[PDB]
């Protein structure tokens, strides 16, 4: 009841019309990260993007790019708009950024990776390292518009109130834009 499949090529406009792409909320393109020739796969994804933008230019595209120089080609497409949500997740760029962040602080790559991954709540009877690790990993990063009761306070105050009362930990907010761990001088507002 959640997944349907259809046979067709992205380069064919009729197949794109069959799946009612004009009413689709987004289009997701997956890449073969283990191809023998990365350039060929990057180019094939480039023309998949070209075809889907040719059919519907306003559709949202979330696609993987194996290389940064091939990623820069997408920025030259007239329909490729970052404001709309055209997200070219660059595997090489993000992996190198994670490696550099691990260089700044070891063990941060796994901390970031486990946040994006949806994990259940698993317990282990015996006291091992895996028990504590699985307890930690079960936490994911979510986003929510905050309540109006908090308005009129500072971000650290709301952090303490959420951690002590609601058992919730805040890392970033929006100021009336994304602000990561804003200082005590910033004040929360309505619709945060």
């Amino acid at each position: 009841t959640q997944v349907e499949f259809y046979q067709g090529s992205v380069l064919n406009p009729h197949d794109l019309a069959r799946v009612k792409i004009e009413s689709a909320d987004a289009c997701l393109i997956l890449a073969n990260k283990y191809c023998a020739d990365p350039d060929a796969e990057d180019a094939s994804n480039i023309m998949r993007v070209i075809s889907i933008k040719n059919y519907h230019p306003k559709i949202r595209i979330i696609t993987q790019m194996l290389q940064y120089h091939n990623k820069a080609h997408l920025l030259n497409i007239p329909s490729w708009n970052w404001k709309e949500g055209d997200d070219a997740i660059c595997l090489a760029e993000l992996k190198l950024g994670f490696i550099a962040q691990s260089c700044l602080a070891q063990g941060l790559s796994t901390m970031l990776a486990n946040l994006f991954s949806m994990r259940s709540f698993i317990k282990i009877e015996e006291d091992t390292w895996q028990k504590y690790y699985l307890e930690g990993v079960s936490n994911e990063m979510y986003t929510e518009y905050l309540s109006s009761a908090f308005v009129g306070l500072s971000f650290p105050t709301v952090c303490e109130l959420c951690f002590v009362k609601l058992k919730l930990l805040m890392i970033a907010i929006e100021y009336k834009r994304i602000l990561i761990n804003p200082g005590n001088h910033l004040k929360i507002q309505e619709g945060t």
């Binding site: 997200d87 901390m111 486990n114 006291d127 990993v137 990063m141 986003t143 650290p156 990561i180």
Partner: protein, 138 residues
């Protein structure tokens, strides 16, 4: 990332500004225009928007965290650090054999994400920290 990139469109730019270090769209526009990075003369305006929170790790073995780290709970240390140093602890970088009674020579540590308030803390633990910045340290 895809699912996380779909259910919240700002996740990718948050990752790029927390990992790459503030990849503003002006820089992306410049890169797309030039296909590379070129030199330029200094501008005094580049010294006011650099005050952010840096990510790093800090040790509980010494310093003012030792007293609360000698058998204390995670919640008390987190609350005290948040109150005092504008800290934000989102995980513990704990040695694999730290919880074991037998003292080993192992050094590598694992990550526990978002430990509870009543979580028992070990003095030899490392925690992940978000700090401020000062512009006159050079």
């Amino acid at each position: 990332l895809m699912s996380a990139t779909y259910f919240n469109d700002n996740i990718l730019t948050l990752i790029r500004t927390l990992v790459t270090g503030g990849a503003t769209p002006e820089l992306e526009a410049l890169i797309a225009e030039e296909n590379a990075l070129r030199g330029g003369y200094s501008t005094p305006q580049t010294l006011a928007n650099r005050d952010r929170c840096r990510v790093a790790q800090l040790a509980l073995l010494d310093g003012p965290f030792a007293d609360l780290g000698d058998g204390g709970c995670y919640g008390d240390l987190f609350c005290k650090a948040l109150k005092t140093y504008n800290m934000l602890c989102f995980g513990i970088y704990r040695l694999r054999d730290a919880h074991l009674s037998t003292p080993s020579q192992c050094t590598k540590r694992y990550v526990i994400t978002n430990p509870p308030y009543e979580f028992e803390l070990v003095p030899t633990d490392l925690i992940f920290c978000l700090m401020q910045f000062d512009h006159n340290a050079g």
